[PDB]
Amino acid sequence: TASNSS
């Protein structure tokens, strides 16, 4: 899976 935040 993949995730990010900013």
Residue numbers in the entry: 1 to 6
Q: Which of the paper's sentences describe this entry?
A:
Curli proteins are produced via dedicated and tightly regulated cellular processes, and their fibrils mediate host cell adhesion and invasion, lead to immune system activation, and scaffold bacterial communities known as biofilms. The two key players in curli fibril formation are CsgA and CsgB, the major and minor curli subunits, respectively. CsgA, a 151-residue protein, consists of five imperfect sequence repeats (R1-R5), defined by regularly spaced serine (Ser), glutamine (Gln) and asparagine (Asn) residues. The first and the last repeats (R1 and R5) form amyloid fibrils in isolation and are critical to CsgA seeding and nucleation by CsgB, while the other repeats (R2-R4) contain 'gatekeeper' residues that temper the amyloidogenicity of CsgA.
